[PDB]
């Protein structure tokens, strides 16, 4: 997927730590993240480092992992997702 | 948005804890804040840390989230908002 | 405003609970206090804590809020106000 | 439930402390509130903080807890409930 | 309603304890006050605190509760009501 | 003023309820007491609590309020005043 | 156990801090939690972080620890448990 | 005991302050209430808050404390007790 | 000691705030609690959090501290103690 | 001083609210209590909480403050003082 | 300054919360404390933690800040100050 | 020892950070770990890396170090140990 | 010193956060702890991590630092110290 | 700039966490700090590590960044700044 | 490009780790860096080694890669860029 | 210098990370350490590796660098320094 990669600047800089943890939780439940991968994203004291961890990880895990990432990103951080897609807020 | 950022000094130092919680409530109802984001703003025992949380969060969430922030800021803490805009009290 | 701040020692220690509630009422009517801010000043079982609440709050809310504070302070607790300004009682 | 959430602004700002305690009592009797949850709602010296406690709590506890909340809200604070639903007073 | 709020200074300072209890009674009969709300207004040893209780309570309970408040206020304390409205005594 | 404070033991224990109400009346007429402050001194079912109310209040209101307090105390309860000053009865 | 894991989204977002502490207490008494594990769940200023702590911890501690977790979850937060199992409130 | 809990709505709203004080006295004599617990029930200026205090307290103190509570409740406020049990007045 | 730990569920949920403060006082006098430990137990606005504080603290302080805890618990909250030990009320 | 501390159980449980206020007054006049400390002891609706406030406060303020405390305690509540010292009533 | 540091044991354990808030107020007025520093000292629910906050803060802020601290400490908590300096009470 | 090695999958993935630190502490006290080895296990921000550190280290240190490891593992994380040995929870 | 090390299990698990902070304060005053070392012990949200910090630190700082540690440990947490030394409570 | 570097000992050891956050805020608004740089200074649980972060960062960012740093340092922590410059307090 | 090379002293010594990671991110999105090259820059525990990695890498990748490097360097670390170009801060 | 080298065992094992960072800071200010050398000492996640870095570095940098090292070591970690020199604590 290119949408993550193309906007990975914004995604790294804008996804809250909360958003990252929650996406991570959904992804763990959906069996695209190892508990270690979860813990390594979550252990970063810095937001943006956790963001880099998750983004590069998901990009390496293929189209479907990326689709799931964007699914839960839309759910948990709808404002950012709509802003990235040039869409308004509803 | 730059108005938040440019005045973020004053906003951090002057928004009451009340003002922060109330803005947060409006924003949650308006679906720009995750309940976790709400709880993390609200859990800060310090006013100004809650203020930093909300401000940086909203700045990361784009123009529309910032507009909504300023909308409810005007409502709930009209004196501060008018003072920031160099306006009198009505 | 500096008059509040410079004399905030005396204001905290000397404004009666009554004086605080009444100032608070005028300020609420004059739309410089949120009902929550009112309730939080009023809920302090201690006089001086209510005083601190109102004083720091008004200082954060700018010149005009401070002017209104001193207006109603003069009205409701004229003796204290005149004593702070080095004035006699009329 | 969305009715609570959509109107949670008004509910936080308008439910009296009495209304909150009484709803809490009904809900405890109806076994949707732990005695601790009761005590934590009740221990807030501020009305609106107790309101936030109960509202977010009930929203997390699902549709049926929310229905019971609105049931007792209608009973104990009928005026507010009718005003929220755009209804007159009978 | 704004008439209560705008004149809440005068209403707090001028409604007799009697006037407050009687308004409260009418309002209880008219089902805008919980017996607890009645008891909490009535238990204030201070007139003006009871006044604050009733006024803020009714303001939170909406337009119709406020209209009923002013109805019975006109009945039981007609002099004050006419003085607030800039009217003479008949 | 120190005379009130130094003798506040005796003043609390010895000023009759009558003496307190009357001093309060003079002070209200002389515009050092808010009607609420009057009502709060007067509402104490206990003499000595009313005494504490007035004494601490006047001490907070400065030298001139204290002078007026002692003026009317001399008038209305001359025996106590002379006993405090180590003076005889005339 | 999969029930915890499959619903861990809801469990993280919905278990009150109270519910977490109480489950933790039962589990400590039942000797599936070290006092440190207790303190680390309890020290999170954020509800959902405490929830993540307990959930991942219990999942790592096996079937029986998970069964005990769900036992006390049913006791202390019966509404949530029934909502997760698609059951009504009794 | 469930009878107290199930009817705690009615008990909170209907036990007179008198009834509460008297039950409290019997319970103190019967050594199920600490003098502090007595004073804390009695110090509530509001009836229903005293009622909540006693009810939750007794529920926490077990079956026998609850039985004694209902014993003296039957004695001192027989009408309420019979109304709760669906019984007539003798 | 295991009696505290085994029943710590009940002890947390049932010891009144009064009971906790009083036990704390006895324990401070008996030199098993630092004044800070006293203040930290007492500062919890929630009963059960104060209970957790004292219980975990005393468990960490050994057999004799636990024995003293149960001694004063028997004194000040005899009903609970007898209920925990499966004993009747005398 | 140890006499206060050793008997602080009895002092907390037995000093009347009156005794506490009066001791507090003497101590304020004797310049060992800040008016705020006075107001905080006096604002406790519960006797024993006021007692705890004064006792811990005076213990922190040293030998001489404690001596003055016991002086006025002997004066105002001579029966309790003699009972604590194992002395009869004269 | 060494006097604060050498006696910081006693200062932490003995300065009342009141004393801390009042010193803090004087220091804020005297422009050695940021409003945030004020709020962070004041937000500690524990006395001694607030004490640690202020003490370490003032020690870091140099000789003159420490001198001002001791000035207002002498004013507001004269008994403690004299006890630390091995002086009697006047 | 083979029990560690054979189950090292589970041990790496399931031992809490707490469990690791505590085992490490016991082992340091029992003189099978250098303070550096302690610090290197403890410095891993990731649980599982700390787990790998301790496990491989202990395996290299022989039968007795492994026996001690399993001893303290049984103590501090009894649930995991029993689950690994196919045993129930007591 | 070996007494700390041999009992460091118990010391880590049993020293209250209070005990740790207070020991730390004494040690800072006694010039065996850098203010940073103080802040790093104090910043641990977990009790036992603060305990590990102080214990390993003091062990590295030699016999005299350890003696001072045990001195203040005896003072501030006498019960634990006596329990470790197999001594009773006095 | 050399003033920062020469006094970086004192600056690291004396700038409060508050001072650091506030300087950081001004600098972010003044566009000498990336939001990540802000978050990395702010995420240090230790004051002095945050201080090191900001100081070394600003030194690397040149004369003008250093001038701005000292500007806001003078504003927010005037006492420290004057002490470093060998100046008194005004 | 020579601007990078000529100033590579300053660039190595002054670009924050943050600046390096962010430039790296932009460059990866702009398809001048392989994910491995990203990971190798990012894996350096030392700032300046990461700086050397990126600088030499980009110099080898030609004029356009260097132009993009300087583009994002201007964006993310504008102060350094302006200082290198002998320009002021805007 | 031989004192460092001869005791480098103890220095590596006993200098806290804090002590190392602080020495490093003094040495950087005193122009015996390159900012890179600072960052490389500071980047070691392990205390003792940072210690080795600084010690070997300073030994290579000659007598005067070693003298400065021991100067600041005496300042910041006086206990260790006195223990190494066979001296007591003052």
Curated annotation (Swiss-Prot), chains A, B, C, D, E, F, G, H, I, J, K, L, M, N, O, P:
Location in the cell reads:
Cytoplasm; Cytoplasm, Cytosol; Inflammasome
How is this protein named in the record? NLR family CARD domain-containing protein 4
Modified how? Phosphorylation is essential for NLRC4 inflammasome function to promote caspase-1 activation and pyroptosis.
Please describe what this protein does. Key component of inflammasomes that indirectly senses specific proteins from pathogenic bacteria and fungi and responds by assembling an inflammasome complex that promotes caspase-1 activation, cytokine production and macrophage pyroptosis. The NLRC4 inflammasome is activated as part of the innate immune response to a range of intracellular bacteria.
Q: Per its UniProt entry, which superkingdom is the organism in?
A: Eukaryota
Disorder cited: Autoinflammation with infantile enterocolitis: An autosomal dominant disorder characterized by neonatal-onset enterocolitis, periodic fever, and fatal or near-fatal episodes of autoinflammation. Affected individuals tend to have poor overall growth and gastrointestinal symptoms in infancy, recurrent febrile episodes with splenomegaly, and sometimes hematologic disturbances, arthralgias, or myalgias.
Domain comment, as recorded: In an autoinhibited form the C-terminal leucine-rich repeat (LRR) domain is positioned to sterically occlude one side of the NBD domain and consequently sequester NLRC4 in a monomeric state. An ADP-mediated interaction between the NBD and the WHD also contributes to the autoinhibition.
Q: Which residues form a coiled coil?
A: none
Q: Can you give the residue ranges of the CARD domain?
A: 1-88
């Amino acid at each position: 997927m290119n949408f993550i990669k193309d906007n990975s600047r914004a995604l790294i800089q804008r996804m809250g730590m909360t958003v990252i943890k929650q996406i991570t939780d959904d992804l763990f439940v959906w069996n695209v993240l190892n508990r270690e991968e979860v813990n390594i994203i979550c252990c970063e004291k810095v937001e943006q480092d956790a963001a880099r961890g998750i983004i590069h990880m998901i990009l390496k895990k293929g189209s479907e992992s990326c689709n799931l990432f964007l699914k839960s990103l839309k759910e948990w951080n709808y404002p950012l997702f709509q802003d990235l897609n040039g869409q308004s807020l509803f």
